[model samples]
Target chain A: AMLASEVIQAYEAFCPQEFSMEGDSRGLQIGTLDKGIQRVMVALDIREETVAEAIEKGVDLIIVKHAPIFRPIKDLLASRPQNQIYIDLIKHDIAVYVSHTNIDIVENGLNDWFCQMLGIEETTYLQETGPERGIGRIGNIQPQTFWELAQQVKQVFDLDSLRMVHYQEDDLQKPISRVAICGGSGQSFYKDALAKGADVYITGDIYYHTAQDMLSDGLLALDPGHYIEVIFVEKIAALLSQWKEDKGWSIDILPSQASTNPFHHI
Target chain B: NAMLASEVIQAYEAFCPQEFSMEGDSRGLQIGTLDKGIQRVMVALDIREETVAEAIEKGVDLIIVKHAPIFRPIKDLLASRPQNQIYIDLIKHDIAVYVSHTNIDIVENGLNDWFCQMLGIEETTYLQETGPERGIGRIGNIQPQTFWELAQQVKQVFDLDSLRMVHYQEDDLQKPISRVAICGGSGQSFYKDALAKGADVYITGDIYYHTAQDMLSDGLLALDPGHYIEVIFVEKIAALLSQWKEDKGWSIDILPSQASTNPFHHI
Candidate 1:
């Protein structure tokens, strides 16, 4: 068996705070990482649904990609759902560690995984965070029409709906071989895609005004929504499982059986 | 020049006083002190980055909202984080925020009544009586209609693209509806009050999956129209403030935020 801190020590070696954007809520958000780990769960978000999963599975430590508690909170009022999440986690004694921007910036991390899934190749950092690491990725792809790649992106993510931004109808038909991608709320980083000459940018949580600006700037954008970050569950869980074998540890690494995505395309 | 911030909130508290608010509810003066001059006021539903930006752009002096921003105690009111950026912007711009939460719901002819007025649900009474003539939700006899028909009315009345329903009986959707109960936002906690009051169907928002399962098991019908339904407070509160402006002859710009803050989309 291992302690939560030990597990995090191994995790930090791969995705350390130095690689993360400044001021990101990361690492031991709630409860202590000093607790002993019997069962470990990797989740994309730590919402009510995932908290229920943690309690049900007897998960001693939950490693989440999205950090809980953004700003300073005033109370643990159970009347509010957001506050209720904190109360429940504390009550059940579930420790949470957040691996966010660092996860996307690290080697074979989220952005790389996105490229792997979508057949993008010959990649480089979209925006360099460190000498060898970055936030998003700019890469080459097979020469295909923009619409063809869009269809592939939709199919790859298996999303029911994908929001897009372009000048007009003809833009989707334009042939392209360049792609830029950053998973989960990259509205602030689209300019990197534009400056890098990406034929199309794929990310989540694009705002309307930003999309209009994208259209004006002649940059094509595809919004797959933030739920795509759910990929973290399987990827991190498998990594922990592999580490368990190599280290000869007696901890159970489980993917959280909860969907925290609030938006559903009806 | 216009009236003081305290004077404006005093006018509001006259109708929907803070004393009527629910137990330990986060209501009143969240961001800035109400000591500033009344220059302009913006009524918003939520205090997000977009809404705060809109208020700043409009040069709003005070923001009267249905919900409070800092529900949980946050550590620092710094500008690095966007959530905290809101607090910083309000202070930098000298904009104030005053919240009217459960008080607005419990007030007579308030959000719950306005909700019923829009839906044509008549003969209404409070669903759960907390004090004399003040309660959490409203229940009343409605025009006899089937559950499916009433659901359509709810969608149209609220201008919603989607809604969720939980029916217990096999033919519950097709059954005739007479009495109905409703709370505008996140009223799952009060559904049992509707059931006990003989409501044929209860309408509210944000019923969790587990609670929905419990509701289904209890033979109680529920309609989850989502918490965004409370976005109605923007128009309602704006109109009320405008009325107060005319009645009190207060010289101030009373504006309703036109931004759509609903994050969900039915694709």
Candidate 2:
């Protein structure tokens, strides 16, 4: 059986710590790094329900894409749900490791998976951090009308509804070829996508003011919501499971069967 | 004569008159008890440890700011970080802090409009329409000037020694700029909007590196004047409070802070 540190090391080898943005809190949040691990739970966020699921599954380690402990903690009271997650993990001897921006920017990481999901080809880095570290993916697809592409995006994400800012809304039938995709909170990527001549930019958590700017600039934007990155649960679980087989590491990786989306549309 | 802190807040709210609840969140008053009051007031763009200390030293009764000191709720005030410590100092000294962010940004004859007048843009209109006469940035037409000449005018107006800019090519720099878009702070988000709305260049502060590159690629010119440009609020708010003082005939004295809280150094 591999130690918790060993599993983290494996993730680090694939997605190095340097890939993460400066000041980003990644890696171990609670429990010992050297704790032995026979089973691991993978999820996007370490929410209350996700932690409870891990405990129920008897998972030894919880790996997440988003760090449970980001802001500085002045007090560690059990009343705080985030703080309680830490306490619960410590008591249960389950280690928590996070790989946030690091995994998001990694070459074959979330952005690539998003590109793959959309059947985008000839993909390149939207914002390259280093050799294999990039923030988002930009690519081309078979030329289609904006309407068709929007339909496919909704289907791929299995969404009930989404917000879009279309400069060419009067002509939704206009052919669109190039696409830019960033998994979460990609307001900053809007200009980069426009600069690269993206027919439409697909991202999540676009602000109202940014939406206004998009309309004024005649740039088209499709906001699917930050929760779409929940695709990370299955994607990361598969990656870790493959690593388990390749490395002959004795560890069971379970994808938490809990919806960690904090948002709902009425 | 001392007035209640609530009086100051009341004057501000009456002046701005919370227009819409959807302007994000309320920015009426943030910290300190409303009961404490005094004669001297400090107006600034931001609140920091140095600014808080200056307020205390000057025996300032109230601090009015354009940008809120506490954008998000703090769980606890640990004295370790200077940011957290400022809150403690404000509370300990019983000095009231009032922030008017989006309210001032969208106010008529306010920040965006003030910026429009300063830049000498004619026929100004709301870049983003939040309401009838309220919006985030202002877009206007200017007398045709080459991009380089426009940049020079901006540098002269803002009194900046240098600026960060992006254009498609050297030849593009010589092209005449007519339509201009102005957002006072963090204008990167508005670049696409500016370009799409047919702006030759966008002027805003706090443009990130990759964003600059994107602007260059898109054949759109952007001027990164730095966030300190919002310091216009000190003079603007001071004049506004002066008008209020004259009309109301209150004994309160308003002082514009001389401290430049911008943490950036070009060197």
Candidate 1 regions with alpha-carbon error over 4 angstroms = B1-267
The TM-scores, one per candidate, come to 0.52, 0.50
Clashes of 2: 3
Question: What's the lDDT for residue A50 in model 1?
Answer: 91
For candidate 1, the per-residue lDDT at B226 reads 90
CA-lDDT, candidates in order: 0.83, 0.78
Name the fnat for model 1: 0.23
**Candidate 2 segments whose C-alpha is farther than 4 A from its true place:** A167-169, B1-267
The prediction achieving the highest lDDT against the true structure is 1
Give a tens-digit lDDT track for model 1, residues B1-267: 557888988888988888898888988877666765778999988888888889888889898988788776776322345665566556566677888889889889999999889888888888887777679899998879999889888888888889777876658879899899999888888988888888888898888889888877777778889988898898888998898888878889899988778888996
